[PDB]
């Protein structure tokens, strides 16, 4: 457990200052790819430990490896319910976090399947916090999925007001705004949302393409309401999308539309 917690404290995701904490010029350091391996090796030795599970789940979720998180969370909750029965220990905040994590996994894992449960869960924990962003963004995405924009917008605005740092929310909001009928703001929001990414990561490119495609869709929604021009702009954005991703069907579909 020591090794696990220290490993996390040393981790890049972690908000702690490892240099200050202990206070060709290659720093005698712990490799990030070693953090995870430490976690994995040592949690197997710490199995039946609550904290280790929590922390591992957090790490895996922070890296968008949701599929890996689900079992560690599921098991994690089991510990809490088992640990309370004999020891009589209570850790409410932890349980609430775990459940939250489960909700997110249910939100992303397979697209629409476990959303309905995620919602019940989000509400279940939201009842306490009310202000919570991570949950409202969840509900947001769920509602964006369910073509239920009137709520998606209102939630997404409130979570966006907390963090213009995050582009996912800004894009999802812009989308929720476009579908609502404030198309210009959406179109503009996406434009920031495209440049702001500035990544070539495998997970970044398709997202650039995604927003590129979204902008186009909205650009057609602009054509919904005599001008012949903007559709042509949509065509350009799509062409870009197809050009960048090369495996991006919706680009070809829309460009086909």
DSSP string, the chain: -HHHHHHHHHSSSS-S-HHHHH---------HHHHHHHHHHHHHHHTT-HHHHHHHHHHHHHTT-HHHHHHHHHHHHHHHHHHHHHH----HHHHHHHHHHHHHHHHHSSTTTTHHHHHHHHHHHHHHHSS-HHHHHHHHHHHHHTT-HHHHHHHHHHHHTT-TT-HHHHHHHHHHHHTTT-HHHHHHHHHHHHHTT---SHHHHHHHHHHHHHHHHHHHHHHH---SSHHHHHHHHHHHHHHHHSS-HHHHHHHH-
* Tokens 């710490």 sit on residue: 46
Classify residue 248 by burial, with Cβ atoms within 10 Å: 0-12, 13-18, 19+. buried
Structure tokens given for 143:
């509602």
Give phi and psi for 111, each to the nearest 5. -50, -60
Q: Which residues of 142-178 are buried (b: 16+ CB within 10 A; e: fewer)?
A: bbbeeeebeebbebbeebbeeeeeebebbbbbbbbbb
Structure tokens given for 221:
């929604």
Cα(136)–Cα(214) distance, integer angstroms: 22
Q: Decide: 139 and 105 in contact? Cβ < 8 Å.
A: no
Q: Decide: 212 and 244 in contact? Cβ < 8 Å.
A: yes
Cα(137)–Cα(160) distance, integer angstroms: 9
Q: Decide: 201 and 213 in contact? Cβ < 8 Å.
A: no
């Amino acid at each position: 457990l020591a090794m696990i917690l220290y490993s996390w404290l040393s981790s890049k995701l972690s908000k702690y200052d490892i240099k200050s904490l202990e206070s060709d010029d290659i720093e005698i350091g712990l490799l990030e790819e070693e953090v995870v391996t430490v976690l994995t090796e040592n949690i197997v030795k710490c199995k039946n430990n609550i904290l280790a599970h929590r922390i591992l789940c957090q790490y895996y979720l922070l890296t968008k490896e949701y599929e890996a998180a689900l079992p560690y969370i599921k098991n994690g909750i089991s510990l809490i319910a088992y640990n309370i029965k004999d020891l009589g220990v209570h850790l409410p905040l932890t349980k609430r976090e775990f459940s939250l994590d489960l909700a997110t996994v249910y939100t992303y894992v397979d697209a629409p399947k476990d959303h309905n449960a995620a919602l019940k869960l989000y509400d279940n924990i939201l009842s306490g916090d009310f202000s919570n962003i991570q949950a409202k963004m969840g509900k947001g995405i769920i509602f964006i999925e369910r073509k239920n924009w009137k709520d998606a917008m209102t939630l997404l605005t409130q979570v966006h007001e907390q963090s213009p740092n995050n582009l996912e929310v800004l894009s999802e909001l812009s989308w929720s705004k476009a579908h609502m009928g404030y198309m210009d703001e959406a179109l503009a929001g996406l434009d920031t949302v495209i440049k702001g990414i500035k990544g070539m990561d495998l997970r970044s490119i398709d997202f650039r393409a995604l927003n590129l495609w979204r902008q186009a869709k909205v650009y057609i929604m602009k054509h919904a309401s005599a001008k012949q021009e903007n559709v042509k702009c949509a065509f350009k954005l799509l062409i870009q999308s197809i050009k960048i991703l090369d495996t991006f069907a919706p680009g070809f579909s829309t460009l086909g539309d």
